[PDB]
Each structure stands twice: as structure tokens, then as C-alpha cells.
């Protein structure tokens, strides 16, 4: 039959792709083809418009599969080609090892580390949900899609995937369709050796809904009326169990050694042959096999084409939604939305950033339809939560509604990170954002890192920054978690010294579109710096208290700005005149132009770096550096800063050293370099 | 009665540390009074000998509880006294705000960031299976002891004790008693609100045993039965699921607000009242609840007195057994072990450290009965399994036995890396290591950084460190990574170049007691280098090519140091003597006297870095940095090395454009600093 060509043409592309690299994964492929062909014959995509904010979505979570990926995008007419993957795996292909978002039309998110995709489709399933409950109104269903996610035993052991599915059960994402590769093949070999656990049992413990199709190698019949059934339960997630042959049809089949391996030319000759293709060709694509999969997209196009007109006649039936939609599909935030970030003078009250967050969180939200957050249990910490929002949740729980934009994430850090991507994946302009305490951003490290890969504007909003927040005690405090974010490419790192800096983190988290954003605030007041405003503090870095006749330059961040200004008044008693930057973004700054950043840090004066953190990073931007590269410690913070000579004093001290180390020496600014 | 007594003295001592501090958490503790109680006396320890091999071992893996376990450990007469209850979360104390193994005598691991303490407990009764399989035989019960843990709903929620659960199922270790505090609360408030999955079921679904106490506010008699039940089920690990109420006996019982911060003063007096204390009183200990405690800890004491007797005769019957085991519970390894690490030379052929790390393993393993370890999925690729030797697995798989020492850990990095912390944890000289790709050793950020806290001696051996991993591109390929982890304290972060630097690794990863080492190795081959030796490289840095009139030194780690050899010799043709200096740990270097660290550095020559990734800690070491602070690429590795000009022509001509930079300059060792 034509679908029988259909999946014997895709398994060979991928096969033939992983032939012309020497490298790759043939052995998922070969098993999931069929599975492959009957989920995008169901699916709603347009190959001419990737964007299109009603298609359904596709996630490969088993990212190493990609030559399957990349194969359904070739045989559909994306722009990918047959001569891309020819290119597979090789330097500068549109056709790279692991899918990623920013490089592949049709990848809507950035997959290979194991446990991901399918955490970033409950994230593209939640947003679906929140986008049709904002927007949707009788006879006018502009969004109705579904999320497709394939995933392995690979993705089934991460811990991530237990986090996001327990949270997608929780709520009751009917429209995501998940499908498990049950071919019990990891890289280990047996899944007996590690993988015994009834997977089935645990999916319906989360309260997902189940279909098992025995013969998934072969019975496309079933995986359809498994995609039918499982649209039918509007209340449940579903997983379908596909049980599956690892490299169905290789001499190897059904052992570790085609998991990730070429597979032998004979073998590959054998393949054609069994399926009636010629074993002397690679890369063959029937024109049955295009015709077919031609009529499918252009009945999909001519869904898109009606629902660009339900599109414009919504806009006339309710003109205000129609016209916020339109803005959040054309990518713009509301007209002067910055004009509700609060603005703060040094007479006003002392005040945790914490707590500034939460009051930028409650002018903002209001005014900006695409902000939706959360918090990992730690809303009232966090402060994440702006009064009277609803939150989002099934509405038949009683505890929100799917219009709520305030998540409740539960003790799932790693799953609200990859979550987050999926919302940012979803499009529509969504803002999105998750609190934690910094120090456990870094659980989620797996799926930050794929935010800054990936180029989504996620938001984490990081609290209990340093050895400010006290009594918890080392275990809590931050010591390494901001080099290592910084040191990480394209994650914008916020460190905001007060209320004026917080804002302009704020403007550039939201503003952003492709850098996503840390924001590490205080759980301890801070006064408000005579100084600082929105306007400088959106620099990333700025002179603070510029001192034309400075013997030093001290440059700090956050908590530490205060304790430098402090410590400037301590040197002029001994003599000595300092100048301050604030650097509340080292991101930001470094983007700045050459100019504007030496005058923030010139040549001729020693610069100190203070920041109660890791000294690794700071040496960009400064001569010597007073930082913490040791654990903190139990007890009230005031004596922990004391402890650490974090002090007014203790800055002085160190700064007049640095005068005196430099005495007839020639600085010039860090910033200078030999290359 | 007197047990009823004892449950208000825990009770009140843990409110009274609480209100004492004014900070911590007393809901957990006043919910898990009655199963801390029951629990302690089915335990066998002793307070004068925490580290008794055959002890039970407990473990609070809702850390935030503690005020409940230092109770436990004042009432038990451990080295922990009422007077350090009184400094509960005060700068310096005996009692932080979250146990920590390295200051609270009888706290075996470090807790607080949740979801660990259970692995911990995983990996504490999967060292207890393997050293009870390796040294018990007839009549000779060398190990027969039982671990207990007490988690929580958020314990629960995070993804890495999913993982540790379904491998602690699958590896059927009966020892282990886990406790659910089924309190229905957490910071968020109800478990309604993000935690609806049934976690009995889950936990059956991974082969768990199961006892459900309706009652666990009172029903001591229903939790002593569960242990003993647990006892009888040898082929599960058990869930005791405990329905308490958080904050029994408090007017806020019930509720989110007990959860976190003291309670109110006339809370504490009515709690006091109802249980027959005096509510003008604090810190009360009845002498009725001391002498009980106390019967119980003698009875314990004699216990220990038979096994000491028990290991005598052991010591007779099984001569060589008998010495194996003494020589391990003194902290020794076999003498003149490191006889068996492999030597090389420069006429040796190129050789993948990866490979090197397979070889190293392959001679040392029998050689060294205490190491044991693993791979998360990545046997064949870490190449962390010796040949010939047999997997941990229960014997009635047919897989392996406990006896084995290979580790098939899954796809479960997290969850691998805290079970690593609580085979250290066991004790008995344990080395273990754990593979995985660097790039996801991220993914077990949450526990690498408390084996660093914990000052655990585990090893990640993590393979495919660079972008010279080639085709599976940017997600796969580390940047950040061993900034992140040279940024946190405590962390050994070897990167060796050839078979002599990955022979020094392992020397110190293997003789370490007190700091976990990250082995970071490469997929591809690398030369072996004139200079190198096992006694030069355990330095952690050292001249590998001295050159008394240097105009440049260039230091470099791993496959960079055959890079920077092969720069000298470009530079000699351009008129330039360079020097060049190996770097294999950073904090092995940081660790030697200053004089030796300045023979390597000196003062009065430009010293260039060169590393494929983050330049982030480089300035400590070097005057201008040459490494890789953006992703990597998909394609084959040489070509990506030449994409980002990691060549010998592109080292030199930095390496040039650095000593132009210094030209009538003045230079002191980046080692100089003024403070
Ligand atoms: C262990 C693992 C593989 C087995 C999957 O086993 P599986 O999901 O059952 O797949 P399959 O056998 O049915 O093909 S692939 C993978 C690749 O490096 C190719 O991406 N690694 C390494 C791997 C480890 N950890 C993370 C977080 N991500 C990973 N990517
Ligand atoms: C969310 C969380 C709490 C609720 C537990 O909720 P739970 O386990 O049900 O406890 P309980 O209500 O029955 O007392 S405590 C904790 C403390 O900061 C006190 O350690 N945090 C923050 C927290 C978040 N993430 C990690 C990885 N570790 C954490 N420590
Ligand atoms: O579990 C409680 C954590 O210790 C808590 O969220 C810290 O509370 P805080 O907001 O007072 O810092
Ligand atoms: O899944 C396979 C990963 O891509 C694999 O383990 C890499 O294999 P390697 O050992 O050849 O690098
Ligand atoms: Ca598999
Ligand atoms: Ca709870």
C-alpha cells in the first residue's frame, strides 16, 4: 500500500542519513516509523507557515531518533531537504545530531538531553490550555490543538519526566498525547538490567489515560484509533505504549548495537529489498509516497486558511481580544506596557528584592496578558504570586481555572524549567516565569541550559541569593550558581541592588525574545541607591558614584552596592577617593559598545570587585576580587556578613590594599585584552 | 506511660529549639514525633560510636525537620546536648538550621535540599547489600543491618527520588524502610494543589512493599509493626506511609503556617498543658524518658559488644576476610595499592583518556576490593565496567549478585550521584564512582554539591568532556561545566592530558577522604606527552616544558596541553620562546605551597590559558585567556576545533598577540594579589 511505502520510505531515509554521516541513531527510527506516519497523518501543521498558533505540535523527547524527525520534515515540505540530510551531522548542516529549535524548521524545541521534550511538551500542552481559556468563545475555537510527544525508555528515567507527568496528570492536560517506545533497548542493553518498574501502573497512578498497541511495528491501524481514543478523554493526558522492535527490520534488530551506531552496508542492502526498494539507491523517495503525504498538507493548508478567517471574524465579534491577539501573534508586548514598572527615589523605605519583584509582578501582570508564572512551592517565599490572580488549574477541582496565569509547580524545579521552555515554545508571545530559591535553580541546570541554547525569554525568578537569607545555612546559599549561569552562553543574569534596578531587570526579562533571564533577589532589605535609575540600571552596568579623582573604582552587584557606597565613605576618612559601578547584568553590559563600557570601567585606576559569591567571572571587569569561594554557614545574617568581613570595614580594608598594590604601577582596564 | 511521655518530650524539645531560635520548623517535627520514637527503638546504634559498621543508619530526608532529629540525638546521649538545642540556627552552632554530616555527630548525610536524603538512603543500604554479600558468611553476620529514612510530601515531588525509587525496587533491597509523612502539606499550602498522583500506587509500581498506619499520631503500636512487617518482606525495599497531622497538638495544626516558622508563645503553652509539661518551663527532659532511652542504648551497647566479639572470631575463621575488613574500617587502603596504576611514556601510542580511565579501572579494581561503581546508561561509551567482573544485581534476576561491583544506575544521573553520596556515606573505605557524558553530570548538580559539602570521596568519571565529542553536538558538548564545578567549593576537578596526568587522577580521586572528584575525559585520542609523570601530575599543576628565557608561558588542561606543544613549536619558527605548563586539578595546584605554585607560574613572563570552554577562573592562573564561551557545533571534532581556531597556528598566533600586549609592561605571576 502507499502508507506501507510511506513508512518503509521514511525508515530508509533515516537509515541512508545515518549511513552518509558514519554517525547516529538508526535503531529508534526503524522502530517508530510507523508510528511516525499515523501521528502525522493526524496532526494539523502547515510546512510553509512553522508559526501557525493553532497547528498541532510534534516533540521528539528521544532526541537522538532526529534522523526520523528530520525525515517526516523532508518527506512534508519543510524547508529541509533531501540534500540536508545527505548533510546530516555535519558541521554547519541544517540537519545536526539533536534537533534544535534555532537551526531546523519543524523542531519546536531544542531535544537529546534525555527527559526534556517531553516536560517541554506539558509545557506547550499547558500553554494551549491557558491560550483557548483567554481567547476561545462559543463558535469560535481559535485554539484547539493537541501535543504530540514522543519519548523512550531514556526519557522514562529521568527524574524530570516523573516531575512533569505527575504535575500533567495533576492537570488533567487532555490535550497531550504522549507515546512511549517500549522496545526495552537502552544504550545499558536489556532494560531488565535497570528498567523493571510497571511504567503503565506509574502513568496511571499521575492520572494519565492508557492505550497499549501490541504491535506497534506493523499496526498503524491501532496507533490511529489510539490517537481517536485518547482525543476522547478531554480530562487525562494520555500515554500510548507503542511496543516496538529497536531497529525493526536490521539484521540487528532488536539489540543495544543499533540504538547508536551505523548500521552494516549488507544490512542496509537487505532493508531495501524486503521493502522493494532498490539496494543499489539511498535517499529514494517515491512520488506515491510525496502525493500522499502532498494531500494531506493541503488539506491541512485549507484548515489554516478557514481558521484565518475565524481569526478576522473573531476580531469583529470581540474586538478588544481580537486586537490583543493580533499584538501577541505580530511578537509585540502592549504599548507602553513599561510605564507600569514601579520607579523608586533613595528616600523611599528600604525593601527586599524579593519583595520589589512581587510589587513589579502586581503593576505588570495586569497590564500584560502573556505574563503567566509560577513558583516550585515556594509562593509565599517567592513572592511570585500577584493578589487576587487565579491560578491556573482544571476548573473541575475547584482550585483555579484554566484562565489562571499563576502555576503552582509543586517541589519540581527541573520539570518547571523544561515546562517553561514549552510555554516560551508555545508562542503567542507568552512571558513566562518560575521562583525558586537560587540555590535550587540549580536542579533544573538540564533544562536552564536548553533555555539559553534554545533562545527562549523564560524568566526564573531566584530568591535567597546569597548568605543573606540567614538560618537556613549552607545547604540554601549560593556560592558557585551565579558563574556558573554566567559562564553558561546567552543567560542574562540580574542581580539588582534596589528598587530602580529590579525594574529594569524586569523591562529586560520580559522584553527579551531570545536570552532567557535569572533574576537573583534578596530574601534581606536594601536600601534604595542615590543613583540608580531604570534608565542606567537597563545599561547592565553603570557608574553609580563617579569620582573624577578616584584612587580605586569598586564594582559590586546586588546586596553588595549598598556595602560598597558604605565602604566609600570608610576610605574617604583614610584618605582615600573611590568611584562605584553597579553591575546588575554582566550579560547586558558586555553588549554594551566599547565606549560606553570603558567609561563605566577605564584604564588609570585599580577596580575591586565585591559580590558575597564566587569570584570566577568577576576578573572580566575588575583587578582584584573580594568575593566568597567557601560555603556559608548557619545563623542570622548580619553575623554571617560580619563573619566573612562582608563589612563596610572589611571592603575598605581590601580596597586601600589594592591602592597600595598598585602604587607605581600602569593599570589599564580590564576590559582590554591582548586578542 | 512512659513512651507517651517521651513523644511530648520530642515534641517539645523540637518547638522550644524552634521558638528558642525564633526560625525553623516545627510541623514535620511534632507530625513525626510518635514514628521518631517508635523508629529509634527498633534501631540498633550507639551514641558513643557513630561509626559502629553494623549500625542501623536513619536518615532525615526532609531536612527542614531537624530540630526533630537533634531531639532524637540529645534525648540518645550523642555528642549533642541540650545546651546545643538552645543554639538551634545560631552562627557556629552544633545545630544548624539543616542537619549537615560534617558538624552534627549521628547525621549521616547532609540534608535540607529535598528529594536527597532518600537517595542517600538508597545508596546506604545498596553499600550495606554489596558489603554484607562481600564479607558474611555462616554462623558470621559481619552486616546485617537496616536503613530507615523519613521523607516528605516535597521529598516526593522532586524527580531524583523517582529515580532512586524505581532502581531501589528493581534492586530489590529489602533493607530498606522508607516513612512517608502523609501530612497532606506543603509551603504552597494543601497537596491538593499540585500533588494529587496516588504515590502508593507509584511506589508498588516500582516493586516497593507497602504498610499504610491510619493513625501515626498516636499509633506507635501500628508503626513498630510496620518495621517488623518491613523486616519480613526481604526481596522489596518498604513505604511506611504515616498519616500524621503536621504541627500535631498546635492550634495551628493542619495548616501551611506550622509548616515553616515558631509558634506563637501561648501555642507553646497549651501545648504544653494538654501533655502534662510545665508550660513556665523550656527544654524540659523527664528522667522517667532518660532512663528508658538509656535501657535501650545499653541493650544497644551490648549488641555491639557481641558483633565486636563476632568480628574476633571472624578474624580467626576467615583469615584473609578478617584483615580485608579490619584494614577497610581503618581508613586504609591496600598497601603500596597505587602499584598497579598504569605508567607510560612518550613512545606509547595516542590513547582516548576515556580509554585510559577503562584501563586504570580494569588494573586497580582487583586490587582494591572497596571500589565499586557505575554508569548512568553509558557503560560501553564511559567505558566504566573492568572486564570480567559481575554486576550488582539481586541474584533472583539472574543478573549479577549483590556481591557484584558494577552498577547499572539507568538513565538516572541525579538519582546516581546522590546514591554515590550514600555508598561514601556507608562508610568501610568505599570508593565509588559514577559515569555519565560531563555534559550531564549537570543534571546531578543537586547532589554533586553536597558530596562537596558532605566532603564525601565519590568520583564522577565523565567522559566526552569537549566539543571534541563531534557530531552530537551542542546539546552534548560542555562549556560551563567544570566552571561551575571549579566555582563550588570542595571539588577536585581533574581534566588529565595522557595516560600519566589520568594515572594521577585516579591516585587522588581514590586515595581522597574528604573531596569528591569530577574526572573530566575525551572521547577522542590524545598523544602521550614528553614531561609527563604520575609524580609530576599529582601536583595538580607543573611545568611540563620549562623554558628559562620564556617570553610566554602557556597553561592548559586535558587535549589542550598537546595543543599548546604543538603552538611552541609554531612560535619557535616565529622567533617566540614559549614554556608550557599542565594543569590536570586546579585545586590539587591550589592546594601546594606558594613557592612551588610561583616555580610553576613566576612573576616577569605573560602566561596565556588555553581550554575548549569557559574562560571563567582562568585569570587565577593565566594574564589573557583563550577558550570557548559560546556553544559548540554538530560535526566531526577536528573540524570544529579548526572552526574555533583550537590549532597550533591559533594558539600562537594569541600567544603572540599576548606578548606584543606586554611589551615594555611589567608582569607578576597571576598567583600575586593584594589581599
Ligand atoms: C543514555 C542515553 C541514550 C539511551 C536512551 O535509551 P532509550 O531512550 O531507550 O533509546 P533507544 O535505545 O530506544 O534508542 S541516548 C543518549 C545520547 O547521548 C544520544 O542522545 N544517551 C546519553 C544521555 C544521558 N543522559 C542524558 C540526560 N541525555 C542523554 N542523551
Ligand atoms: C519547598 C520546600 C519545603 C516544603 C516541603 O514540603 P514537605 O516536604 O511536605 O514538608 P512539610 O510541609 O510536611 O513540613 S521545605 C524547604 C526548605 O527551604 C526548608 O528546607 N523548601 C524549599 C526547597 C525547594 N527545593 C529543594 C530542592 N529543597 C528545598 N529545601
Ligand atoms: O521551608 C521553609 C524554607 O526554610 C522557607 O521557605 C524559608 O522561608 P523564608 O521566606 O522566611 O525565608
Ligand atoms: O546514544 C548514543 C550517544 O550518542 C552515544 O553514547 C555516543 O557514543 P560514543 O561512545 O561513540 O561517543
Ligand atoms: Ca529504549
Ligand atoms: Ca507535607
Not at 535503531?27 to 516509523?33: D, S
Not at 532488536?254 to 544490512?267: E, I, Y
Not at 512581587?358 to 517567592?382: F, H, Q, R, Y
Not at 537560587?438 to 533544562?447: E, M, P, R, W
Amino acid at each position: 500500500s502507499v502508507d506501507q511505502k510511506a513508512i518503509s520510505t521514511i525508515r530508509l531515509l533515516a537509515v541512508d542519513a545515518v549511513a552518509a554521516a558514519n554517525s547516529g541513531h538508526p535503531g529508534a527510527p526503524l522502530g517508530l516509523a510507523p508510528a511516525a506516519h499515523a501521528v502525522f497523518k493526524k496532526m494539523r501543521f502547515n510546512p510553509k507557515d512553522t508559526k501557525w498558533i493553532n497547528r498541532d505540535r510534534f516533540v521528539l523527547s528521544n532526541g537522538h531518533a532526529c534522523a526520523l524527525l528530520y525525515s517526516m520534515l523532508v518527506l512534508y515540505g519543510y524547508d529541509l531537504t533531501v540534500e540536508d540530510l545527505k548533510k546530516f551531522r555535519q558541521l554547519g548542516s541544517k540537519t545536526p545530531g539533536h534537533p534544535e529549535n534555532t537551526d531546523v524548521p519543524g523542531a519546536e524545541v531544542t531535544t537529546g538531553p534525555l527527559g526534556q521534550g517531553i516536560c517541554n511538551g506539558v509545557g506547550i500542552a499547558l500553554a494551549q490550555a491557558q491560550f483557548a481559556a483567554t481567547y476561545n468563545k462559543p463558535d469560535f475555537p481559535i485554539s484547539d490543538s493537541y501535543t504530540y510527544v514522543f519519548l523512550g525508555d531514556g526519557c522514562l528515567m529521568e527524574g524530570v519526566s516523573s516531575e512533569a507527568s505527575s504535575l500533567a496528570g495533576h492537570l488533567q492536560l487532555g490535550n497531550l498525547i504522549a507515546f512511549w517506545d517500549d522496545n526495552k533497548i537502552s544504550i545499558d542493553g536489556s532494560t531488565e538490567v535497570a528498567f523493571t518498574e510497571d511504567v503503565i501502573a506509574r502513568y496511571k497512578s499521575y492520572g494519565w489515560h492508557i492505550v497499549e498497541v501490541s504491535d506497534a511495528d506493523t499496526d498503524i491501524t491501532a496507533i490511529a484509533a489510539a490517537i481517536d481514543e485518547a482525543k476522547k478523554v478531554t480530562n487525562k493526558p494520555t500515554l500510548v505504549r507503542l511496543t516496538t522492535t529497536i531497529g525493526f527490520g536490521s539484521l540487528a534488530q532488536g539489540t543495544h548495537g543499533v540504538h547508536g551506531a551505523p548500521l552494516k552496508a549488507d544490512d542496509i542492502k537487505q532493508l531495501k529489498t524486503k521493502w522493494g526498494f532498490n539496494p543499489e539507491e539511498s535517499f529514494a523517495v517515491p512520488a506515491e509516497v510525496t502525493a500522499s503525504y502532498n494531500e494531506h498538507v493541503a488539506e491541512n493548508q485549507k484548515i489554516q486558511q478557514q481558521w484565518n478567517e475565524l481569526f478576522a471574524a473573531y476580531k469583529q465579534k470581540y474586538p478588544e481580544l481580537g486586537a490583543e491577539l493580533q499584538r501577541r501573534l505580530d511578537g509585540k508586548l502592549p504599548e507602553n506596557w513599561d510605564k507600569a514598572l514601579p520607579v523608586y527615589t533613595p528616600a523611599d523605605a528600604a525593601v527586599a528584592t524579593r519583595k520589589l519583584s512581587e510589587i513589579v509582578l502586581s503593576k505588570i501582570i495586569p497590564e500584560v496578558p502573556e505574563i503567566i508564572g509560577g513558583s516550585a512551592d515556594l509562593t509565599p517565599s517567592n513572592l511570585t504570586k500577584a493578589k487576587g490572580t487565579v491560578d491556573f488549574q482544571p476548573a473541575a477541582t475547584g482550585l483555579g481555572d484554566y484562565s489562571g496565569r499563576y502555576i503552582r509547580y509543586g517541589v519540581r524545579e527541573h520539570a518547571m524549567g523544561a515546562i517553561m521552555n514549552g510555554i516560551a515554545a508555545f508562542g503567542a508571545n507568552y512571558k513566562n516565569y518560575g521562583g525558586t530559591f537560587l540555590n535550587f535553580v540549580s536542579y533544573a541546570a538540564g533544562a536552564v541550559r536548553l533555555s539559553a541554547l534554545s533562545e527562549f525569554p523564560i524568566t526564573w525568578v531566584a530568591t535567597h541569593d546569597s548568605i543573606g537569607l540567614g538560618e537556613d545555612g549552607p545547604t540554601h546559599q549560593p556560592i558557585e550558581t551565579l558563574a556558573h549561569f554566567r559562564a553558561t552562553p546567552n543567560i542574562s543574569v540580574w542581580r539588582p541592588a534596589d528598587g530602580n534596578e529590579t525594574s529594569a531587570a524586569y523591562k529586560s526579562a520580559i522584553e527579551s525574545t531570545h536570552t532567557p533571564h535569572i533574576l537573583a533577589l534578596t530574601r534581606q532589605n536594601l536600601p534604595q541607591l542615590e543613583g540608580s535609575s531604570i534608565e542606567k540600571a537597563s545599561k547592565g552596568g553603570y557608574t553609580l558614584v563617579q569620582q573624577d579623582k578616584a584612587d580605586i573604582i569598586i564594582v559590586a552587584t546586588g546586596s553588595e552596592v549598598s556595602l560598597a557606597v558604605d565602604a566609600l565613605k570608610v576610605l574617604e576618612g583614610q584618605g582615600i577617593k573611590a568611584g562605584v559601578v553597579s553591575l546588575p547584568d554582566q550579560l547586558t553590559f558586555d553588549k554594551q559598545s566599547e565606549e560606553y563600557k570603558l567609561s563605566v570601567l577605564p584604564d588609570g585606576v585599580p577596580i575591586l570587585s565585591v559580590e558575597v559569591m564566587s569570584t570566577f567571572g568577576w576578573s572580566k571587569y575588575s583587578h582584584q576580587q573580594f568575593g566568597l569561594n567557601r560555603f556559608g554557614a548557619s545563623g542570622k545574617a548580619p553575623e554571617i556578613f560580619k563573619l566573612f568581613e562582608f563589612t563596610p570595614e572589611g571592603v575598605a580594608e581590601r580596597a586601600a590594599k589594592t591602592v597600595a598594590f598598585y602604587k607605581g604601577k600602569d593599570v589599564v582596564s580590564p576590559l582590554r585584552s591582548a586578542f
